[PDB]
Design a protein around this motif. Structure first.
Motif, mmCIF file in Angstrom:
data_model
loop_
_atom_site.group_PDB
_atom_site.id
_atom_site.type_symbol
_atom_site.label_atom_id
_atom_site.label_comp_id
_atom_site.label_asym_id
_atom_site.label_seq_id
_atom_site.Cartn_x
_atom_site.Cartn_y
_atom_site.Cartn_z
ATOM 1 N N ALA A 120 0.787 -1.167 0.049
ATOM 2 C CA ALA A 120 0.106 -0.039 -0.069
ATOM 3 C C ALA A 120 0.863 1.314 -0.111
ATOM 4 C CB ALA A 120 -0.827 0.128 1.184
ATOM 5 N N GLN A 121 0.323 2.270 -0.724
ATOM 6 C CA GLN A 121 0.914 3.592 -0.756
ATOM 7 C C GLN A 121 0.185 4.474 0.096
ATOM 8 O OE1 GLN A 121 3.833 4.076 -2.409
ATOM 9 N NE2 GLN A 121 3.962 6.121 -1.513
ATOM 10 N N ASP A 150 6.870 5.049 9.596
ATOM 11 C CA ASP A 150 7.011 4.754 7.939
ATOM 12 C C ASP A 150 6.019 5.662 7.088
ATOM 13 N N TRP A 151 5.146 6.545 7.843
ATOM 14 C CA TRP A 151 4.125 7.095 7.089
ATOM 15 C C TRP A 151 3.961 8.671 7.397
ATOM 16 C CZ3 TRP A 151 1.314 4.017 3.877
ATOM 17 C CH2 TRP A 151 1.397 2.628 4.077
ATOM 18 N N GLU A 152 3.558 9.255 6.363
ATOM 19 C CA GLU A 152 3.467 10.624 6.460
ATOM 20 C C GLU A 152 2.010 11.072 6.647
ATOM 21 O OE1 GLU A 152 4.638 13.336 3.472
ATOM 22 O OE2 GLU A 152 5.255 14.786 4.964
ATOM 23 N N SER A 168 -22.555 8.786 17.645
ATOM 24 C CA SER A 168 -22.539 8.590 19.062
ATOM 25 C C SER A 168 -21.240 8.363 19.595
ATOM 26 C CB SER A 168 -23.624 7.514 19.507
ATOM 27 O OG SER A 168 -22.956 6.348 19.114
ATOM 28 N N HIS A 169 -20.255 8.340 18.935
ATOM 29 C CA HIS A 169 -18.838 8.353 19.499
ATOM 30 C C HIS A 169 -18.076 9.576 18.818
ATOM 31 C CE1 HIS A 169 -19.687 4.018 20.578
ATOM 32 N NE2 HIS A 169 -19.556 4.558 21.719
ATOM 33 N N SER A 170 -17.089 9.834 19.353
ATOM 34 C CA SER A 170 -16.029 10.788 18.706
ATOM 35 C C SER A 170 -15.251 9.805 17.921
ATOM 36 C CB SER A 170 -15.090 11.468 19.794
ATOM 37 O OG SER A 170 -14.671 10.862 20.928
ATOM 38 N N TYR A 171 -14.469 10.354 16.884
ATOM 39 C CA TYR A 171 -13.773 10.055 15.998
ATOM 40 C C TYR A 171 -12.565 10.774 15.129
ATOM 41 C CZ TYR A 171 -17.234 12.010 13.048
ATOM 42 O OH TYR A 171 -17.985 13.274 12.228
ATOM 43 N N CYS A 172 -11.858 10.101 14.517
ATOM 44 C CA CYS A 172 -10.790 10.905 13.928
ATOM 45 C C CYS A 172 -10.489 10.293 12.369
ATOM 46 C CB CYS A 172 -9.650 11.145 14.516
ATOM 47 S SG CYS A 172 -8.125 12.157 14.215
ATOM 48 N N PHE A 173 -10.245 11.231 11.443
ATOM 49 C CA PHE A 173 -9.884 10.746 10.295
ATOM 50 C C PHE A 173 -8.500 11.092 9.885
ATOM 51 C CE2 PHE A 173 -14.400 11.687 9.088
ATOM 52 C CZ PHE A 173 -15.073 10.490 9.224
ATOM 53 N N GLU A 174 -7.592 10.102 9.490
ATOM 54 C CA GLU A 174 -6.322 10.595 8.948
ATOM 55 C C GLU A 174 -6.044 9.638 7.641
ATOM 56 O OE1 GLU A 174 -3.455 9.358 11.960
ATOM 57 O OE2 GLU A 174 -3.918 6.980 11.693
ATOM 58 N N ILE A 175 -5.251 10.504 6.890
ATOM 59 C CA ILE A 175 -4.622 9.951 5.543
ATOM 60 C C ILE A 175 -3.263 9.815 5.931
ATOM 61 C CG2 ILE A 175 -4.753 9.873 2.958
ATOM 62 C CD1 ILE A 175 -7.236 11.565 2.927
ATOM 63 N N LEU A 176 -2.602 8.634 5.545
ATOM 64 C CA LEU A 176 -1.206 8.490 5.749
ATOM 65 C C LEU A 176 -0.628 8.059 4.200
ATOM 66 C CD1 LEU A 176 -1.063 6.600 9.066
ATOM 67 C CD2 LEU A 176 -1.293 8.905 8.691
ATOM 68 N N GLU A 177 0.560 8.537 4.168
ATOM 69 C CA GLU A 177 1.336 8.265 2.817
ATOM 70 C C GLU A 177 2.535 7.804 3.145
ATOM 71 O OE1 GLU A 177 0.323 11.000 -0.327
ATOM 72 O OE2 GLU A 177 0.911 9.110 -1.569
ATOM 73 N N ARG A 178 3.053 6.728 2.502
ATOM 74 C CA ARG A 178 4.186 5.817 2.752
ATOM 75 C C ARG A 178 5.345 6.776 2.244
ATOM 76 N NH1 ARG A 178 5.707 0.589 3.302
ATOM 77 N NH2 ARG A 178 3.411 0.135 2.868
ATOM 78 N N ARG A 179 6.493 7.094 3.364
ATOM 79 C CA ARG A 179 7.469 7.724 3.025
ATOM 80 C C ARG A 179 8.627 6.798 2.381
ATOM 81 N NH1 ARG A 179 7.556 11.797 6.715
ATOM 82 N NH2 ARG A 179 6.532 11.461 8.730
#
Ligand SMILES: NC(=O)c1ccc[n+]([C@@H]2O[C@H](COP(=O)([O-])OP(=O)(O)OC[C@H]3O[C@@H](n4cnc5c(N)ncnc54)[C@H](OP(=O)(O)O)[C@@H]3O)[C@@H](O)[C@H]2O)c1
Ligand SMILES: N=C(N)NC(=N)NCCc1ccccc1
Ligand code: NA
Length: 159
Positions: free
Chosen positions: A107-108, A132-134, A148-159
């Motif tokens: 995966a990239q 290993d990820w940015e 009903s729950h807190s949450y977080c989104f992230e996108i990680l790119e391979r370094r």
């Protein structure tokens, strides 16, 4: 490129049943926006969990056994799964644990939802080292009247 998209509760537990904590509307919207009109690769148990083809996406199912639904495309290996996607800009791997384990080294990009909920589960997203990820995108969200729950989104790119 190959991308993984996953929703992780506490301890990296995953699931795609239509029940809490896996049905947060905000995460369903995030999943749709990052997968629409892209091929989606999934394992047979994730196929069984979803219960129907995802519209507007080429659905590719991994199974060691012959397929049981001609609406989608069945493949018997990782390499076959990738080949079935053809020459496209982005392949989305949508689960489950066994499939994520095999595709993570290929995966990239990682599209991760983190959910602030404890849930019992036998399956987890694989361990990865943030080293290993940015992080190229990150946003925390509070619980609200829809989620009903807190949450977080992230996108990680391979370094
Ligand atoms: N009861 C059981 O023994 C059992 C075992 C595993 C999972 N589960 C259920 O499934 C849930 C999720 O497991 P999961 O997220 O790991 O499932 P998943 O990744 O969605 O699906 C895994 C399945 O995909 C197929 N597959 C994966 N890699 C493959 C490869 N390289 N070549 C060919 N086929 C491949 C196999 O299907 P085929 O089995 O059709 O070959 C495999 O069993 C568990 O929490 C549990 O509820 C149950
Ligand atoms: N589990 C993922 N692959 N990604 C994700 N962020 N959420 C999945 C949301 C979902 C979509 C379709 C059916 C059931 C659940
Ligand atoms: Na995009």
């Amino acid at each position: 490129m190959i991308s993984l998209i996953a929703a992780l509760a506490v301890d990296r537990v995953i699931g795609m049943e239509n029940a809490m904590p896996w049905n947060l509307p905000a995460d369903l919207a995030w999943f749709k926006r990052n997968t629409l009109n892209k091929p989606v690769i999934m394992g047979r148990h994730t196929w069984e969990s979803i219960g129907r083809p995802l519209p507007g996406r080429k659905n590719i199912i991994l199974s060691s056994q012959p397929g049981t639904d001609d609406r989608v495309t069945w493949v018997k290996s990782v390499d076959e799964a990738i080949a079935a996607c053809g020459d496209v800009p982005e392949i989305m791997v949508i689960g489950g644990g066994r499939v994520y384990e095999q595709f993570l080294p290929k995966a990239q990009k990682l599209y991760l939802t983190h959910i602030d909920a404890e849930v019992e589960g036998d399956t987890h997203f694989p361990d990865y080292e943030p080293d290993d990820w940015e992080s190229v995108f990150s946003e925390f969200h509070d619980a609200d009247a829809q989620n009903s729950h807190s949450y977080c989104f992230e996108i990680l790119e391979r370094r």
